[PDB]
Amino acid sequence: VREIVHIQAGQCGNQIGAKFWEVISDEHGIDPTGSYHGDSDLQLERINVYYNEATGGKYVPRAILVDLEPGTMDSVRAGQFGQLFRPDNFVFGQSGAGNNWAKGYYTEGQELCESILDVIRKEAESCDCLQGFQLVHSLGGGTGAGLGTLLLNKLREEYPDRILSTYSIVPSPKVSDTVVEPYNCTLSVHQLVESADEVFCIDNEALYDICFRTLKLTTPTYGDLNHLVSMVMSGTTCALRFPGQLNSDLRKLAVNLVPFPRLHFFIVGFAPLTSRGSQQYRALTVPELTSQLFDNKNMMAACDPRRGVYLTASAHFRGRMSSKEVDEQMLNIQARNTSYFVEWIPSNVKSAICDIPPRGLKMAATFIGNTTAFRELFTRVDSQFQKMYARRAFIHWYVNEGLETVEFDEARSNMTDLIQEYEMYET
Amino acid sequence: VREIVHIQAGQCGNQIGAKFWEVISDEHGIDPTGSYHGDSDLQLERINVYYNEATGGKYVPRAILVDLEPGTMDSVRAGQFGQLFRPDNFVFGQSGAGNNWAKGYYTEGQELCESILDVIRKEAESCDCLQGFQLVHSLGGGTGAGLGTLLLNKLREEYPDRILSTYSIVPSPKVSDTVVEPYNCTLSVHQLVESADEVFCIDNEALYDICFRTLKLTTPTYGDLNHLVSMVMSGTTCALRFPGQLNSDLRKLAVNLVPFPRLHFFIVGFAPLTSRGSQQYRALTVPELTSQLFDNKNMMAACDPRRGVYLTASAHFRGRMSSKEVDEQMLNIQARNTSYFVEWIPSNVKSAICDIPPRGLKMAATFIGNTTAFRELFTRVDSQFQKMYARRAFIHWYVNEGLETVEFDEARSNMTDLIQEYEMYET
Amino acid sequence: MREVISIHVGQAGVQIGNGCWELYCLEHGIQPDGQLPDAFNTFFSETGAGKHVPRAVFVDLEPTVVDEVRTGTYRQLFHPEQLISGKEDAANNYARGHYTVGKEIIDLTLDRIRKLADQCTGLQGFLIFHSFGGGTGAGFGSLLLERLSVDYGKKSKLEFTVYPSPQVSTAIVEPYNSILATHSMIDHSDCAFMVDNEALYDLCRRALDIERPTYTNLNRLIGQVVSSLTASLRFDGALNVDFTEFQTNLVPYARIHFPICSYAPVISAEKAYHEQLSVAEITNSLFEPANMMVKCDPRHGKYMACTLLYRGDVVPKDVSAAVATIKTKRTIQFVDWCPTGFKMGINYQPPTVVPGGDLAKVQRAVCMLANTTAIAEAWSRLDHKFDLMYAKRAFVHWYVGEGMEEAEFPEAREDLALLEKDYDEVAAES
Amino acid sequence: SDEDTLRSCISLHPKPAPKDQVKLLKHSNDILRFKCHMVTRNSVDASRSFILTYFMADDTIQVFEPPARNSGIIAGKWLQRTKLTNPDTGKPFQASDFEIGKVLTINCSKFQLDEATEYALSFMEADPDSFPQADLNRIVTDFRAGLKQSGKDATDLFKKFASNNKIDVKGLQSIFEAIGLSINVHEAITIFRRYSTESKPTSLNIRDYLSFAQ
């Protein structure tokens, strides 16, 4: 009884959310009509984690959907799992996205915020217990970055105790899909640092790179890209859903991985990943799993760990397996590469094992880590922001909404201090 | 548990290595698909030396494929045993070979070296132990001579203890397949002397000669020539793979046959060999094998031993025979021909016996020796080098890559001292 | 769901309107009578029975061009109220088309536009078509734009208008009218696109292999661009792009707004079999100066911001590689103070071909709108031509007699000079 | 080589073995291509499609894997042109051993032939002596003899075993099994190629089949 509330915002959040709800529906074995048709009683033990039950044995997910324009909403309606979602949980506006952070936060944000909050209050107060919230949104856009952070602050006010774990999309450094991203990203960073307990950063360039290097897909579409992200959310909350030899929920993750309140940005990785034709040659076991997890190419964020150093890291293993072999790998990988860990924190690598692996895979693992290599990510957006801010023109679109120019100075100042915060702990 | 890593670089090495894997697969009874369909339990004792196990009951070989152009890999994919190789082990460039040592070493070598090493590191650290590496390359070429020596330097840095045994083909003195070989050969030798523990030299002209003399072939192909090379390939590692009366591995071979750090270039030979119509009438026994082994015509390298003197020699015997018979012949062959052995080292002939002979042969033998006759081989390349080094114009192709001309002077100086080194030890 | 209203003024606007609406009907599958043998609500309204009615208004001060539609095949589709015709045209006079004759009909047309807006619950912007050289395109268009600015405020007013050609010209008084319309447009317009006939003639001759084009061929090429821009709102795609999204990224300043247009692939039926036309080929062709619908070389200037729209068989991964290759081109210039510069849109609905058309059936297509300082070359040419005529006062009496006070001539000259400064100070670097 | 082995046996000087110049010079440009797939337990490899190439000038088999998008497998030449010996017969492979529906063991891997190129089928038909599987007269005579022995009307067989009044390859096999005689998949396709009145020989018609049956 550790119910988790799912919240989606914007274009990216829904399409990732739509693909995410397919996977856990498959793992528990939920028919698209909402009726249970699975294959094991273990699926019904703690189905309360993600799904609610109606009168007619028809499982409805704890999902809330938010957008400024209905274009994204209707695509979800026609999706394969479209009938599953609760009809009243769809909350949407009737105005263009605008791709403006100030417009999304202030003008249309306030109108939707009051209606959205009561929608969440329906789901929040309908469970015997409520562990935390889970947000999927984009930072380069205007609706997810703007309205999502507004909802994030309000959620903290009403429910301070609960874990506000979020999944975010980081703008690409080489070529990106929006000009005004450095404004939107920097402004959202200031809200995210103080409010959100746990933030996972995901970059599209790594996703394209992983598919080309490993899976050998010539034309990897968004369906493939969102699916790789879809594993990670399923893996993290799996400890709640299934038994194991060492349980580790979200609150365990934050305690171990967060040494200081402001250093909580994380990198994630998933294993095993193999080309469809290559799998026959592989000898998938625990030692092979550890090889991919600590390999820098499997990281889903374009921040090479070797350029920085690690502080904390946590790994989960799924599947019936010897506990000893898992524990030995944590020791060997830590002692072998001591140059990338801080001396003043021993035992930087957490381990946990869960009984039931996902479909098709005899055992799978999930990696979540925290490292100073994020200083590369924030330097890229800072250098672009200064070139943005010197040419004071794009501020025009933000001023008309009502944003004061001092906020841009404030947003960079806090984010600048975040950069040097990672710098000093390297010593 | 003395695993050996095999690496194939270039056009020449890949074709020989492809023929090499056919023999090893045949001896152990491994299917081209990788399944085991052999006939004896003894084949499964120590297959770990050359093979890894896959999940689906297949066996994958410890082979890494290297070349600058994709043309050589596609033929390997078309090879009879092409499926056996691991798909990810194929690392290739996208540029012409160039037949240039400087271009292979500097321009394309650095780009490939980083990618190749991590592929090697996968196999190197995936096994319980690793005794030595096994490289197949040509010296007259541009890819295997240039890049092969580069990887040889890096392998020594990471793995100083392991035996870096290599197999090389020497440019022919009468007619050869490339004009600029003495440049490529001279540069390679300086890397070869200091880095590699064991080097066996092979000459194509002798491989023509033995096929015409003994095997009586008027249309021998590269299949027959590479097949003869593959015999010495399996014989040397045969002591690790099978039980015997007197075991002798690589490190035993290096200790006995190498009296001084730089005098380690070796000549190889195999017995028995017969015209394939006359094989019925041959009274093949242990003394008959001894007659072939020390016969100069059977030597795989075109450097007549009688013109120099011997320092060390070693022979292996495969099959069930008498221990006294093997030991007696080496005493007789040493005393009967004392004029070709140094007085200051007695017992110049090392022996070994292996229980299981190769398929089709009731017993077989392998001969490896070291002698001052190599001074003939280095004289041929050195004398040519002086002629075209005066005509400094060929260097302009190597100059454009970035090679500085004193490297030619440095390399010849080392080769000249190596020639002098064999001169002084004749006394 | 959400609606866009199209407004056409002048002979050119009505002529382009004819080509644009025939493409909409074929794409959606609507018969010319309004019946059928989705995104219909975006451009069309359901009359109650089977017929569909479009959201468009046709305006001209002379009846000939409007009466062609009234007697044409498409006459059944349109509402008689939407077809508004004056009595006598402006005779290539801005003053006549603004003060004397324009004000006779301005409030009549505005009622019909406002009446159409009542049915548009999700109206997000307007589309307006002009010919700068014509009297009605400039004089009447300025009066309509000024009214709509105060009538509706923060509603996007996007314009797609015909710029005078560098050398090809049909009206002598053209430099006078274009400058006068420049002053009214620059403050009120949210964003205005430029195309010129001289560039289209060369494109309609070289790439599309037709030796003797007419206005009819040029109008269909214009129609393709409008359909591509509106496709992201009409149909599904991996990356939806709205009008507001276009407005924010393309314009860096208030007065720099002017973008340019391009389209690819533009090819004949014969050459289609010889080229695969993947994402790499179409994107590379968009950047050559030959494909510009405005006859100005981008190499003279620099690029501020660009937008690409992809239709058909396009995978997002291949888009990133194509644009990344674009970034490596030293032949392309960007200002340092704008590093990203790109927004990409991918839509699944492929282009629709026309019976008796000029384009082959390409499975995928791409459209580009970009902002560049190269347009400053065009403004200088018009500025120099005007000065010679005004120095000797060659046509002032015609304008003054029709309500114009002469003080307007130096003021409209001054604002254009300020605008040329604006493009120059943007082109400066720090 | 093994050819050199025979030279060594025959003469004290192993004079070079003569290659069949008549066969090489005539049949240099003749190549038969066959589409095949693996019969293996691996689900991934079972879905891989291959094209087999047999050279008549020198009796070699070459196997190529066409590139497939989003397959994740490095396609290309799967087997070089090789002088391979049939494990079933102990003799070098010949063109008569290549039959549609016949499973061939190549590189001790198991391959099932699926389709053949238009020239390969036409060349096999043009020389019935070397390709009994394409000898239609033998098939027709055996079919007529079996029908007479069974005493079953062909019209009733057509009504019983045809789907939508058309006979598939499986349907023709079913009819042959009902009579009591075997038909190879190559023989059925030869029947379809000769008799079927469509551009692509995938089905037979009632009057057309009766002409073949009577």
Ligand SMILES: Nc1nc2c(ncn2[C@@H]2O[C@H](COP(=O)(O)OP(=O)(O)OP(=O)(O)O)[C@@H](O)[C@H]2O)c(=O)[nH]1
């Ligand atoms: N590209 C293009 N331009 C056109 C077309 N028809 C007219 N034009 C432009 O229109 C200009 C002539 O002015 P008009 O077409 O009469 O426009 P107007 O504002 O209505 O002028 P008036 O008739 O006096 O009211 C020419 O210079 C053309 O550039 C057309 O079909 N295609």
Ligand SMILES: Nc1nc2c(ncn2[C@@H]2O[C@H](COP(=O)(O)OP(=O)(O)O)[C@@H](O)[C@H]2O)c(=O)[nH]1
């Ligand atoms: N990987 C992935 N990225 C997406 C998807 N949809 C949108 N994005 C990214 O989200 C970023 C901003 O999109 P935007 O429309 O502004 O989202 P929103 O305004 O927050 O709703 C773009 O750079 C896209 O690359 C998707 O389905 N998959």
Ligand SMILES: Nc1nc2c(ncn2[C@@H]2O[C@H](COP(=O)(O)OP(=O)(O)O)[C@@H](O)[C@H]2O)c(=O)[nH]1
């Ligand atoms: N014995 C033998 N020699 C070969 C084979 N393939 C190539 N060679 C020889 O290798 C020499 C140099 O070839 P090259 O392609 O430049 O070798 P690489 O560049 O070092 O890989 C030539 O003289 C060839 O005759 C083979 O299969 N067997």
Ligand SMILES: [Mg+2]
């Ligand atoms: Mg007019």
